[PDB]
Every structure is written in structure tokens, then in C-alpha cells.
Amino acid sequence: VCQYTIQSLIHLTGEDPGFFNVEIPEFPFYPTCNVCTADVNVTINFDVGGKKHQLDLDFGQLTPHTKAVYQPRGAFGGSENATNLFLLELLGAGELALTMRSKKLPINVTTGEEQQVSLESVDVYFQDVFGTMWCHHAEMQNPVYLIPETVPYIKWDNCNSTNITAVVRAQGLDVTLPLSLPTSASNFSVKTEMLGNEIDIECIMEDGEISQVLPGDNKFNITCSGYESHVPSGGILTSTSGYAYSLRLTPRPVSRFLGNNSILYVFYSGDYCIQSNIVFSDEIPASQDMPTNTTDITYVGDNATYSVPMVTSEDANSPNVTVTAFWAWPNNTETDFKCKWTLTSGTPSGCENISGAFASNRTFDITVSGLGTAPKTLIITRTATNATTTTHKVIFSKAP
Amino acid sequence: ISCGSPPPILNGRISYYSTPIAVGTVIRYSCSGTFRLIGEKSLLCITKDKVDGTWDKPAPKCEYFNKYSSCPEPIVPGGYKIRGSTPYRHGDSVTFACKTNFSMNGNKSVWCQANNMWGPTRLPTCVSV
Numbered sequence: 001v002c003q004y005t006i007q008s009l010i011h012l013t014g015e016d017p018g019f020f021n022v023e024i025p026e027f028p029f030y031p032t033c034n035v036c037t038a039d040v041n042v043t044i045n046f047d048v049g050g051k052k053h054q055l056d057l058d059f060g061q062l063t064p065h066t067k068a069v070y071q072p073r074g075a076f077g078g079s080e081n082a083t084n085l086f087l088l089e090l091l092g093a094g095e096l097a098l099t100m101r102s103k104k105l106p107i108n109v110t111t112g113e114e115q116q117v118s119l120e121s122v123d124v125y126f127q128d129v130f131g132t133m134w135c136h137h138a139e140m141q142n143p144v145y146l147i148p149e150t151v152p153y154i155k156w157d158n159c160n161s162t163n164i165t166a167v168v169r170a171q172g173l174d175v176t177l178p179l180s181l182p183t184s185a186s187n188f189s190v191k192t193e194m195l196g197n198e199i200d201i202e203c204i205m206e207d208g209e210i211s212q213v214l215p216g217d218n219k220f221n222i223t224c225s226g227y228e229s230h231v232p233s234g235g236i237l238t239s240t241s242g243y244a245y246s247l248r249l250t251p252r253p254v255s256r257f258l259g260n261n262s263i264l265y266v267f268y269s270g271d272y273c274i275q276s277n278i279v280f281s282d283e284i285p286a287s288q289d290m291p292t293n294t295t296d297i298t299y300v301g302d303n304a305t306y307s308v309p310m311v312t313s314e315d316a317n318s319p320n321v322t323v324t325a326f327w328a329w330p331n332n333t334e335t336d337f338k339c340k341w342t343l344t345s346g347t348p349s350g351c352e353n354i355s356g357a358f359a360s361n362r363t364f365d366i367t368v369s370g371l372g373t374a375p376k377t378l379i380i381t382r383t384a385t386n387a388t389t390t391t392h393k394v395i396f397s398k399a400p
Numbered sequence: 401i402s403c404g405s406p407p408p409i410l411n412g413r414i415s416y417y418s419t420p421i422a423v424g425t426v427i428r429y430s431c432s433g434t435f436r437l438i439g440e441k442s443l444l445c446i447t448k449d450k451v452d453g454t455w456d457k458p459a460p461k462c463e464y465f466n467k468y469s470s471c472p473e474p475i476v477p478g479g480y481k482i483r484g485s486t487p488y489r490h491g492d493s494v495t496f497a498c499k500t501n502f503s504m505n506g507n508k509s510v511w512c513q514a515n516n517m518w519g520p521t522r523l524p525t526c527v528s529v
């Protein structure tokens with residue numbers, strides 16, 4: 001039973017790089033919670049020559065504080081080693097991505113249907129610490145056919161090695177490379193390919209070559225093959241102010257299916273080629289916590305109040321509204337996450353020293369009791385149907 | 401057996417290969433940044449008489465990038481597209497497949513050329529035989 005469902009529409013444009021990447025940005029990752037977990041399952045919806053076929057993947061319990069990359073714990077309806085064809089990755093700021101290999105079939109099909117498998121949609125099911133079931137439906141604008149094949153190893157001759165490592169963090173590659181050219185601001189063209197473990201990503205300059213290179217930074221967009229990220233891919237050509245050129249490349253998404261010690265080839269013209277080894281940071285890039293607004297509240301006595309307004313895009317006639325609260329750095333998943341309110345609800349059992357109620361305004365007034373002398377921080381989250389989950393960090397401190 | 405050196409490509413490059421070239425070797429073609437690659441990019445060393453090796457298709461070609469080129473949507477009666485989407489600009493490719501009652505003849509993939517035509521081959525056909 002889904003309490004909130006997010007819808008997305010995805011369209012594959014360029015060539016298939018060997019993986020399909022689906023971003024899921026709207027599930028709650030609660031801040032100041034070493035102990036918060038999330039149960040995640042995924043359903044892949046295939047069409048096989050007109051016949052519907054669902055692949056159910058079980059990713060177990062996410063533990064964002066300690067692990068950023070997840071493989072399926074099990075698969076139902078899939079081929080052998082289907083669990084090896086999918087990755088779930090935490091991207092930071094409450095976002096995650098689902099990645100599937102595109103050139104190996106994850107389901108069983110008959111002789112003759114091997115080229116008739118198309119991906120229709122992906123459903124992601126996400127149950128948070130408060131018991132709320134979240135769902136994401138990613139629809140393909142057009143069903144995308146899987147073309148199974150083995151990708152041969154390819155290496156490019158006549159490419160200068162650099163000692164500079166291209167480091168990928170949360171599917172974003174970042175690297176700055178020194179180039180040299182006879183001409184000097186002289187147009188500039190660059191394309192890249194990232195090759196490894198049967199993955200082949202090609203990135204090119206959208207808007208074409210740089211016809212006149214200005215001094216300083218020359219920002220230019222680049223488009224990589226596969227499903228595009230909502231964060232744009234880009235690069236910068238730094239010119240000295242013969243003449244020095246520095247090339248910053250920030251393409252995304254770059255899947256760790258490439259493996260460590262895959263190779264980034266940079267072909268540029270003013271073809272010259274430099275190659276750099278790619279490494280995938282196993283460490284989390286940044287805090288996975290969803291972004292929050294912080295408010296400092298003072299109080300006298302042991303009672304304090306905070307009013308939670310409607311969230312952005314929350315309509316006055318929203319079928320479902322949910323407000324939740326917990327004290328920062330909770331210790332016990334069994335007793336610290338009972339403070340959840342819906343439009344029909346009371347302060348549940350086990351929610352101690354906190355009261356809340358919706359007004360006719362749909363404003364949610366929360367009151368905290370038994371406040372000691374030290375500052376205490378309350379993490380308040382509000383969601384509404386087809387609205388934006390918003391988390392408030394409210395620090396209650398004794399009036400001076 | 402072994403293949404001789406692969407066919408050259410003007411304004412492009414060929415991936416690394418060791419000599420002599422063994423049957424089963426795959427090489428990749430690419431164009432020089434500004435140019436666009438027209439045709440299948442991977443060549444395979446095969447043997448038909450079990451004596452000499454030969455490459456399984458001709459080399460692709462590189463066209464100078466024409467930012468203005470645009471090809472109409474290609475349509476194959478009896479088949480359907482599995483890769484490609486409008487708009488089609490210079491160097492973009494489409495890949496076809498035939499419906500179940502039909503068999504394909506010709507190359508399954510075509511590229512939008514500078515002269516606003518799909519090439520280098522004709523569109524494939526899907527025919528019930």
C-alpha cells in the first residue's frame with residue numbers, strides 16, 4: 001500500500017552505453033540519524049514480444065551512514081545471476097539511482113524472443129523508519145529494447161598517458177587535465193569515451209565546437225550517451241591570461257559498472273588523445289541527508305511550540321498529508337519513531353512529550369513538553385500528495 | 401589463419417590490434433572529433449575457407465560535420481525501430497528489427513548522412529519468405 005507515489009518519464013536518446021540509469025530523487029533520508037534505515041524493493045516491468053513479465057528485486061535494508069552501494073539480496077522472476085545486473089547507489093542530498101546492465105538479459109526468454117525484450121517501467125518501493133511506504137514509478141516514454149551482446153575489449157593506440165586520475169563520486173566524474181595546442185585564442189573540439197567491463201560511454205559537446213575561445217573559463221555543455229541525469233554534464237576550457245589550456249570535465253552519469261581501472265579517453269582538436277585511469281570512490285561523496293531548513297526557537301519553562309506550514313505545491317485539498325518528528329540522533333528504531341500524524345490521527349502511543357494537531361488551515365501545530373535545560377533538536381518532516389517533502393530542523397534552547 | 405591490416409579510414413582512427421591479426425579479433429573505428437562516423441564501427445576478422453582471414457564488412461567513413469543536415473524519419477514496412485529518435489541530425493543512427501512473420505535483408509542500422517539521406521546502405525527490408 002503506497003502512501004505517496006512519485007512519477008517520472010524517462011527517454012533514451014543517444015546510443016545505449018551498456019547500462020540504463022534511473023534517478024529517484026524524492027525519497028526521505030532523515031538527517032542526524034545514524035540509525036535510520038529503509039527497506040527497498042524494485043520491480044522491473046518488461047514486455048517480451050507482447051507478453052508482460054515482472055522482475056522483482058529485493059535490496060534489503062539501506063544503511064546510509066555506513067554503505068552507499070547496494071546489490072540485490074535476491075531476485076524473483078529473473079535469470080541466473082540477475083542480482084549481478086543491478087545496482088542501487090546513494091547520490092547525496094537524499095537522492096539515489098538505480099542502474100541496470102542493458103546488454104545482458106536479466107530474465108528468462110525463449111529462443112526467438114531474445115531480441116524482443118523491452119523495458120516498460122521501473123517501480124521502486126521504499127519503506128522508511130516511520131513505516132511509511134513510498135513508491136516511485138519511472139515510465140519509459142517509449143519502451144526500450146534490450147539488445148543482448150558481448151562487448152569486445154577495445155583500446156586506443158596513440159594516446160598520451162597522464163598520471164592524473166579521473167575520480168567518480170556519486171556517478172559524477174570530475175577531472176582537470178592539462179592540454180597544449182599550437183594555436184591560441186583557434187576553435188576547440190573535444191569528445192570523450194569511457195571504456196571498461198563491457199561498458200562504453202561517449203560524451204560530446206552539445207552546441208558543437210567552440211568557434212572563438214575567450215580568455216579565462218570557457219563553459220560548454222556536453223552530452224553523454226545513456227539516460228541523462230537531472231544535473232547537467234559540462235566542461236570548462238581554461239585559457240592562460242604556446243598558451244596554457246586546462247580542461248575540466250564533469251560528465252555524468254558515469255556508472256561504476258565500468259569498474260575500477262576503466263579508462264577515460266579524451267580526444268581533442270584545436271586528433272590529439274590523452275588517457276586517464278578512472279577510479280570510483282567507495283566513500284560517500286557528501287551527506288546523504290535530505291536538505292533541511294534550520295530554525296532556532298527559544299522558550300521559557302518546559303513548553304515550546306512550532307508551526308509547520310503547508311509544503312510547496314501542497315493543495316488545500318490534498319488527499320494525504322503526513323507529518324513526522326523525532327529527536328536528533330535517535331538510538332532505538334523500536335521506540336524513537338512513533339511520532340507520526342496524518343489528517344486522521346492522534347499522537348500515537350510511544351510518542352512521549354510531543355503533541356500535534358492540524359488546524360482547519362492544514363497548518364500543523366506541534367508542542368513539546370518536558371524540555372530540560374539543554375538545547376534539543378527536533379527533526380520534523382511534512383509530505384503531501386503530489387507535493388514536496390520538506391524537513392525542518394528545529395533547535396529548542398532555553399531563553400537567556 | 402590471420403587477417404591483413406584493416407581497411408584504412410580517412411580522417412579517423414582505428415583501435416589497437418596486435419600483428420598478425422587472429423581470427424575473431426574485433427577492431428573499432430572512430431572519427432577525428434569534428435567528423436561524423438557513417439556506418440558500422442566494429443570490424444570482425446573471420447575465415448570462410450579456413451585458410452585466410454578477411455574482415456566481415458567494409459570500413460566505415462568519416463564525414464565533415466554538417467550542423468544543418470537533417471534526415472526524415474526512416475520507415476521499414478514489416479519492421480520497427482529499436483534505436484533512434486527524432487530529430488535526426490548528421491551522424492545519428494537508427495536500428496530496425498522485423499516483425500515476427502518477416503525476415504530482414506540488409507543492414508539493420510542506418511546513419512543520417514550529410515546529404516540528408518540515410519546510409520551508407522539502403523534501408524533494410526522486412527519480407528515474409
Ligand SMILES: *[C@@H]1O[C@H](CO)[C@@H](O)[C@H](O)[C@H]1NC(C)=O
Pocket residue numbers: 001002003004005319320385
Ligand atoms: C493516500 O494513502 C492511501 C494509503 O494510506 C492510499 O490508498 C491512497 O491511494 C492515497 N491517496 C492518493 C491520492 O494517492
Ligand SMILES: *[C@@H]1O[C@H](CO)[C@@H](O)[C@H](O)[C@H]1NC(C)=O
Pocket residue numbers: 039040041058074125126127
Ligand atoms: C520486499 O520483498 C521481500 C521478499 O524478498 C519481502 O520480504 C519484503 O517485505 C518486501 N518489502 C517491502 C514490500 O517493502
Ligand SMILES: *[C@@H]1O[C@H](CO)[C@@H](O)[C@H](O)[C@H]1NC(C)=O
Pocket residue numbers: 076077078079080108
Ligand atoms: C530461469 O532459468 C534459470 C536457469 O538457469 C532457473 O534457475 C530459474 O529458476 C529460472 N527463473 C524462473 C523459473 O523464474
Ligand SMILES: *[C@@H]1O[C@H](CO)[C@@H](O)[C@H](O)[C@H]1NC(C)=O
Pocket residue numbers: 161162163164
Ligand atoms: C604518468 O605516470 C607515470 C607514473 O609513473 C609516470 O612515469 C609518467 O611520467 C607520467 N606522465 C604523465 C604525462 O603524466
Ligand SMILES: *[C@@H]1O[C@H](CO)[C@@H](O)[C@H](O)[C@H]1NC(C)=O
Pocket residue numbers: 219220221234
Ligand atoms: C548549456 O550550457 C551553457 C553554459 O555552459 C549555456 O550557455 C547554454 O545555454 C546551455 N544550453 C543547454 C541547451 O543546456
Ligand SMILES: *[C@@H]1O[C@H](CO)[C@@H](O)[C@H](O)[C@H]1NC(C)=O
Pocket residue numbers: 158159160271272273274
Ligand atoms: C602526445 O604528446 C606529444 C607531445 O607532447 C604530441 O606531439 C602528440 O600529438 C600527443 N599525442 C596525442 C595522441 O595527442
Ligand SMILES: *[C@@H]1O[C@H](CO)[C@@H](O)[C@H](O)[C@H]1NC(C)=O
Pocket residue numbers: 260279280281282283
Ligand atoms: C576503486 O579504487 C578506489 C581507490 O583505490 C577504492 O577506494 C575503491 O574501493 C575501489 N573500488 C572497487 C575496487 O570496487
Ligand SMILES: *[C@@H]1O[C@H](CO)[C@@H](O)[C@H](O)[C@H]1NC(C)=O
Pocket residue numbers: 301303304355367
Ligand atoms: C504549554 O505551556 C503553557 C505554559 O504557560 C500553557 O499555557 C499551555 O497551555 C501549554 N500547552 C499545551 C498544549 O500543553
Ligand SMILES: *[C@@H]1O[C@H](CO)[C@@H](O)[C@H](O)[C@H]1NC(C)=O
Pocket residue numbers: 359361363
Ligand atoms: C492558519 O491558522 C493558524 C491558526 O491556528 C494561524 O496561526 C496561521 O497564521 C494561519 N495560516 C495561514 C496561512 O492562514
Ligand SMILES: *[C@@H]1O[C@H](CO)[C@@H](O)[C@H](O)[C@H]1NC(C)=O
Pocket residue numbers: 291292293389390391392
Ligand atoms: C528550506 O528547507 C527545505 C528542506 O526540506 C529545502 O528543501 C529548501 O530548499 C529550503 N528553502 C530554500 C529557499 O532553499
Ligand SMILES: *[C@@H]1O[C@H](CO)[C@@H](O)[C@H](O)[C@H]1NC(C)=O
Pocket residue numbers: 500501
Ligand atoms: C502473422 O502474425 C499475425 C500476428 O502477429 C497473425 O495474425 C497472422 O495470421 C500471421 N500471418 C502468417 C502468414 O503467419
Ligand SMILES: *[C@@H]1O[C@H](CO)[C@@H](O)[C@H](O)[C@H]1NC(C)=O
Pocket residue numbers: 457458505506507520521
Ligand atoms: C551491409 O552493408 C554493406 C555495404 O556497406 C554490404 O556489403 C553488406 O552486405 C551489408 N550487410 C548485409 C547483411 O547485407
